[PDB]
Amino acid sequence: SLLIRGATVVTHEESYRADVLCANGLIQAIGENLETPSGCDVLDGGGQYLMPGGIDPHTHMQLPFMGTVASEDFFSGTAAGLAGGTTSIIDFVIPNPRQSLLEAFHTWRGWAQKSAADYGFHVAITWWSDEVAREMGELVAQHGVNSFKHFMAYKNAIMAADDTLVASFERCLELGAVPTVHAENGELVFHLQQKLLAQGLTGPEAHPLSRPPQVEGEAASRAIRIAETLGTPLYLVHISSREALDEIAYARAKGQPVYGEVLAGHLLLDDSVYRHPDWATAAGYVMSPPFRPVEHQEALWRGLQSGNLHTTATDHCCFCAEQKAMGRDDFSKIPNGTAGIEDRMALLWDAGVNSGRLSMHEFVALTSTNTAKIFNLFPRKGAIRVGADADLVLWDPQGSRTLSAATHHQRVDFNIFEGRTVRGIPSHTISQGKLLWAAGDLRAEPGAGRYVERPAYPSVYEVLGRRAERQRPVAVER
Amino acid sequence: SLLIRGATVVTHEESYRADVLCANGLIQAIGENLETPSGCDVLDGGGQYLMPGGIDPHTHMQLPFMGTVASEDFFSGTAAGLAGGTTSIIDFVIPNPRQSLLEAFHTWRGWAQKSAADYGFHVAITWWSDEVAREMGELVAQHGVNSFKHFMAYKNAIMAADDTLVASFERCLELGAVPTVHAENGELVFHLQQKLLAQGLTGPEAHPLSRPPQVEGEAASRAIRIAETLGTPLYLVHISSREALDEIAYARAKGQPVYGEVLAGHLLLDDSVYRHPDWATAAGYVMSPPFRPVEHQEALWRGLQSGNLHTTATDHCCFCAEQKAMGRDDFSKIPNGTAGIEDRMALLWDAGVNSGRLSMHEFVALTSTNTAKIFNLFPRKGAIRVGADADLVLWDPQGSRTLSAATHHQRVDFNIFEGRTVRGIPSHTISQGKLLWAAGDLRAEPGAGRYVERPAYPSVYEVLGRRAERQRPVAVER
Ligand SMILES: Nc1c[nH]c(=O)[nH]c1=O
Ligand SMILES: [Zn+2]
Ligand SMILES: [Zn+2]
Ligand SMILES: [Zn+2]
Numbered sequence A, B: 001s002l003l004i005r006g007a008t009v010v011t012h013e014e015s016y017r018a019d020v021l022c023a024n025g026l027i028q029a030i031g032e033n034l035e036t037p038s039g040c041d042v043l044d045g046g047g048q049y050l051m052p053g054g055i056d057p058h059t060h061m062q063l064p065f066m067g068t069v070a071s072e073d074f075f076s077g078t079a080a081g082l083a084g085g086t087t088s089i090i091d092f093v094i095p096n097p098r099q100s101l102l103e104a105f106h107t108w109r110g111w112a113q114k115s116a117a118d119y120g121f122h123v124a125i126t127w128w129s130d131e132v133a134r135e136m137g138e139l140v141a142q143h144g145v146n147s148f149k150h151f152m153a154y155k156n157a158i159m160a161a162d163d164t165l166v167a168s169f170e171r172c173l174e175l176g177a178v179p180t181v182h183a184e185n186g187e188l189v190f191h192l193q194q195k196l197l198a199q200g201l202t203g204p205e206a207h208p209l210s211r212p213p214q215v216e217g218e219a220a221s222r223a224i225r226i227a228e229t230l231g232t233p234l235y236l237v238h239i240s241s242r243e244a245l246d247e248i249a250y251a252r253a254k255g256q257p258v259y260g261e262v263l264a265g266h267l268l269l270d271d272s273v274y275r276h277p278d279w280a281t282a283a284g285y286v287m288s289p290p291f292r293p294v295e296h297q298e299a300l301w302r303g304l305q306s307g308n309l310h311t312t313a314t315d316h317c318c319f320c321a322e323q324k325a326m327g328r329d330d331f332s333k334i335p336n337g338t339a340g341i342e343d344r345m346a347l348l349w350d351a352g353v354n355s356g357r358l359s360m361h362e363f364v365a366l367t368s369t370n371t372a373k374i375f376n377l378f379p380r381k382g383a384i385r386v387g388a389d390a391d392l393v394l395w396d397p398q399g400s401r402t403l404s405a406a407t408h409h410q411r412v413d414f415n416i417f418e419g420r421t422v423r424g425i426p427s428h429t430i431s432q433g434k435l436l437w438a439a440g441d442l443r444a445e446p447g448a449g450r451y452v453e454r455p456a457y458p459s460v461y462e463v464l465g466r467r468a469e470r471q472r473p474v475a476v477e478r
C-alpha cells in the first residue's frame, strides 16, 4: 500500500486537494485526511500536484530500422520514461513485408517482456493479403490490439499505398480498431531524396528539404479522406506542419473523428538545427517528419489550444552518434529518430503551463487522458478515480531540471534539447501503485511491467454506426 | 471583310461604344463611326454587346471512350459551339496505355480536320516511359502543344499514379508546359464502385455515391501539392466540389499558381437528377465528377466571384440513349459525359450576369480571356484589339432561348438543361472574321477551322524561375 498525502489532485478537468491511496496496483481511495492502513508507506505531496502518469502512445524501443537496431531497449526506455513521469507506453509491432503479423507480434512481446512499466502495441500494416486481414482480426479478438499503424512514406520498404490503406481501414472498421497513419507522401520524399543526392547535397541540411511540409499535408489530407469515405476514425501521429494541422481542423470542422498527435520537438525546435556546423549535432535532429520553420511551431501550439491536436508523444527512437554516422555521406541513410520519453512531460509543462498557453487540466488531457480515451483505456488509465490503475506522477512546480545527454536516463548520446532548463519536474513517479522514481532515485526492475490490452470499439464507433445507418443507400424503383 | 457597327464592346475589364472592322481573319480597326471599306459586309450591333468569342478548353469530340465513340464529332461539335457563341475549343489527345503520344496526336489531327472553327489539343499522359517523356518534348517543340492532361481516376485504364504524376509534372516544368488534372482519387472510386455493385445498387443513382465530393478534394489536394513541390503551375479541370475549391483557394492563398475550371452543369444542377424514376433520364446526367448536393453549387459560384475559379468549359462528351444504355445493369459501364458546348455561354450569362453574381467583364474573363491567358493564347484570342484573331460573339441581352435536345445543334439526344429558358443569347458569332451564326442560320463548313498552336512558357514560368533561383538548396561546409 502507498498513500500520497496533502497534494492537489489535478485531472483533465478540475483541481482539488485530496489524498490518494493505492494498493494492489489500483487506486483504492481518494479524499481529505484519509486513514492510513497499517504498514502503508506514505509520500508527502505538500505543495505539489498529483496527476495521472503520462502515457506515451508513440515509442520504438529497440526497433530494427534503416540498417540497424535502436540503442534504447524496452527496459531502459520504460525506465527512463518513469524518471520523467511517464508510466505507460504504446509501441509499434512493425512486421516486414510479406511477414506474418502474429509472428511479428509474439517476437515483439518477447522483446518487450523486459519492460519496467505498463506497455501495449499498435500493429503496423506493412503489406496486404487475406491473411493480414485474418490476422488483424485475431490480434484484436485475442491479443488486446485495437489500433493499426500505416506508413505512407518509406517507399520501397514499409510504405502502404492507397490500395492497402483502403483495404486495411475497411478492416479496422469491421474490427472496431482505430487506423493510425504516419502521413508523408512517399513518392515525393523518394523523388526529392534522389534529386538532392544527385545534386550532391548529402548533408543533414538536405533532410528537411527532402520532405517539406506540403508532403505531410498531402498525406494527411489523403488519410483523412479515405477515413471519411470508409467511415472510420483516424489518428495521425506526430503532426509537424501547419498544412497537416489545417487538414485535421478542416475535417473536424466537418465533425469527422480525427485525432492529431504532436511531439515536444515539433513544438519547440525549428529546421535551423539541420544546418548546424557540426555534422553529428545536425544528424542528431534527423527524424521524420523533420523539424520545421518557426511558423509551424506557432500553428501547432494553437492546435493544442484549439482542440485540433489531441495527444503528446515522443516517437522515441534512439540512435547513437555511430549509428547516425551510418549516413555521413548520404542524409537518406541516417537512421531517423530522436529521444524524448523522459523529457516530454517536463518540456510541455515548462513551455505550455509555465508560459500558460495550456492550463494544468489541458496538460493532463494532453499527456494521458486524451490518449487513454482515443485508444479505449479510459478510465483504467489517464484517470484519478477509485478502481483506476495506480499510475501517477507527483509534480513539483518549482523544481528545476536541465536536460542533457550526459545525465538523462535514456540510453543515447544525444538530447535534442541539450542544455535546456525546465521549471516544473516530476519529483515522484508511481507505476502500478509502486514508487519507481523518487527525488533522483530510479527503482525500475526488468520485467515489472504488464502488457496492456485495449478493447475494440471505442465509443466513437457507436456514433459512426448510427451515422452509417442513416446513410444506407436506397435504390430508385423503376 | 466584316464591320460590326454600333455595338457596345465588352471586354474582360471594360465596356465602350465602338465599331470593329475585321479582315483577313483578324481585327483590323476599332473606333467610333469607322469608315466602311468598299465591298465590306456590315453587321448592325445596335443595342447589343460585342465580346470575344468563347473559348471552351475542355471538349471530347468523337472520343472513343467507355466502349464506344461519342455521338458528337469534330464538325458537329464545333458548329454547335458557334451557334452558342463559342469560337474555339481545346480538345484532348488521349493515347491508350503503351500507345505512342505522337501516333495518337496525328490520329486526332485527322479526326479534327473537319472542325468548323479553330481548335487545339491538350495531350493526356496515360502511361510513362522514356519514350513518353521524349514525345512530350516533341509535341511542344513541333506540334504547338503546351499543356498535358493527367487522369487521377480510371483505375486499370488511363490512371496516373503519383510516380507518373511526379515524372510528368517534372517534364512539364522542363518544357514550359502547363500540367492539367482530372482530380478524383481512383482507388476510392474503384473501391466504392465495386462495393455498391456488390450490394445490388446498379442504377444511375449509385453513380454519385461512388465518387463523393471528398474523393475530388483529395485528388485536388494531391495534384496541387505535387505541383507545389515540383515548382509548376497547375490547372484543375471541371471542379465540382467545395472540398476541391477549398484546396485551390488554400494553395492560391499561399501564393501558388493554381487555376480552376468549372462547368455550367456543376454550377446549376444538383445530384437529385440521378434519382429520376426514368432510367434513361437519370443516365443522361452521368459524368465524372458527378453533380453534387446544392451547397456545392453555392461554393462554386463563390469561387467564380472570389477569383478562385478561373475558366468555364463544358467537358463536351456526347452519348445518345442507346450508348448510355450500355450500363443499364451496371452504372459503372454508363459512358460518362454530357453535352454543353452550345449552351455554356448563354447558361452563364443568364445565371451569372442577369442575377448580378457576375459583371459582364467577369463573364468575358470566364468564357474566353482567362483560358487564353492560362494556355498562352492571349492576346491572339480572348481579346478585342487590332491584330487579334477575329473571333467575336454579338450578344442580345434581351433575346431569349429555350434549351432543348429537340432543337439544339449538338448531335446528341439529351440536354441536361432540357426546357430551361435563358435571357441573353448570341445573335451572331464571328469566327476567323467570318459570320458563321446569324440569328438562327448556322453557316459552319467542315474543314474551315485551323489547328491552333500554343507556345510554351506562359508568363507564370518567368515568376516561377525567379522563385526557384531564390530557393536553390545550399550545402553547409564542414
Ligand atoms: N473524358 C471525360 C468525359 N466525361 C467525363 O465525365 N469524364 C471524363 O474524364
Ligand atoms: Zn512515424
Ligand atoms: Zn514513429
Ligand atoms: Zn474529366
Ligand SMILES: [Zn+2]
Binding pocket: B058, B060, B315
Ligand atoms: Zn473530360
